[PDB]
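Record format v2
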Amino acid sequence: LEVYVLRLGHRPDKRISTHVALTARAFGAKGIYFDTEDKSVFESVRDVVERWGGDFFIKAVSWKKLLREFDGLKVHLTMYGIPLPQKLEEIKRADKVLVVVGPPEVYELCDLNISIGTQPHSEVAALAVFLDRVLGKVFDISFDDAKIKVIPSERGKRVVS
Amino acid sequence: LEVYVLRLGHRPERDKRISTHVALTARAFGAKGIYFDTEDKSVFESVRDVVERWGGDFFIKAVSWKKLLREFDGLKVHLTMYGIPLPQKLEEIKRADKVLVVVGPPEVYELCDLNISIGTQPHSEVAALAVFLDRVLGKVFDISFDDAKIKVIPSERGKRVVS
């Protein structure tokens, strides 16, 4: 099961968008699609892939085009949607998932509209929980490519280069 | 298990959106309230507006961060990528009765009882917070306020709301 993120609606939003993309990466996503660059965010994210490893991508595309040709299950994280645990078994059954995080037709074009509780909060939080429950990787993730690794400790900041 | 957040390092010129995200995540996922090492009247009004309308008694208040740590009556948990993976400390955390989780000065690492990582890659303090509260409290899908002026009713394709 491969997961991809669609980031709709960014507007120069520079710090939340990088947060979304680095969350996507940290949590097991293969890459992230944007409905507009913005070269600040693209660089920030490309810097981390280089220092910290792997081949997570980030690229601008036509968001409606992407939603229309993918190619696997399409999921929209929205406060107004169906709680995740109700659809999880069906989401896990997919081979490829496009998860969309923010436009009326997004609700129509996506296969499922899913909520991470029904309170207002963060698309960064919504995504963190989705990918944690869906991929189960955040704790096991590492990259052999990496030039900076963390080794966990009780109260230090231990890094390998 | 009641959980408080302490948000360190907010810069009014910069951090308004993320700090609002952090606070609202604290509330959505079951934390009792959040402390900031500085007001920021503007972020506080956003949060308070949300509590007024969406319900409950989640607070936001400014403190001196050192004083609050030094005199927090419970387990102080600091969320950092340099920390011990939450799975190894999770039962210890859950056994406590009050938890202060710290989201971002080196003395923090010495002042907190535990330093905890949500994975060892750089991501987001909102994401770290989200996953922490979801695993620790397990409340995000069960949380609702009967006293609320506004409530969402989940739908397959729509935006439905009781007011």
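The CA atoms of residues 73 and 91 of chain A lie 7 Å apart.
Chain A has one domain: 1-161.
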